[PDB]
Known about the structure:
The structure is cut from a larger assembly and holds chains A and B. Chain A contains one helix and no strands. By secondary structure, chain A is mostly helical. Chain A is rod-shaped, with a radius of gyration of 29 Å. Chain A starts with 8 loop residues before the first helix and ends in a 26-residue tail after the last helix. Helices cover 47% and strands 0% of the residues of chain B. At the A-B interface, loops of A face helix 3 of B. It is classed as proton transport.
Amino acid sequence: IARTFFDAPEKNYERTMAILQIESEKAELRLKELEVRRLMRAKGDGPWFQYPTIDKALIDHSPKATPDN
Amino acid sequence: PGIVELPSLEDLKVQEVKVSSSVLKAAAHHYGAQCDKPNKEFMLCRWEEKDPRRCLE
Lengths: 69, 57
């Protein structure tokens, strides 16, 4: 029965170790994602939460009719 | 905020050109042809400085 149907204890042991490593890395990544999202919401210096402003390519720099502008 | 820098009344005193509009319009073309250099210098100074107080002289 052990030779035909059952997995070895060593195989299960190392499979469990691999599973634990993968989910531990995923959990640390999730916590870092939450911290990064909170920081970029708070400060707004990063690539996320960049709400649009007015583009400066629409300004006319030619001389106008009145010098005071 | 700041205090506005304003020239005194002695800096604004000059002998005026006391003629009417039709007098100026009669001789407008010759005035543009003959008095071109100070007029163009004043207008360039006005358009570059963007400030009357810096162009008074």
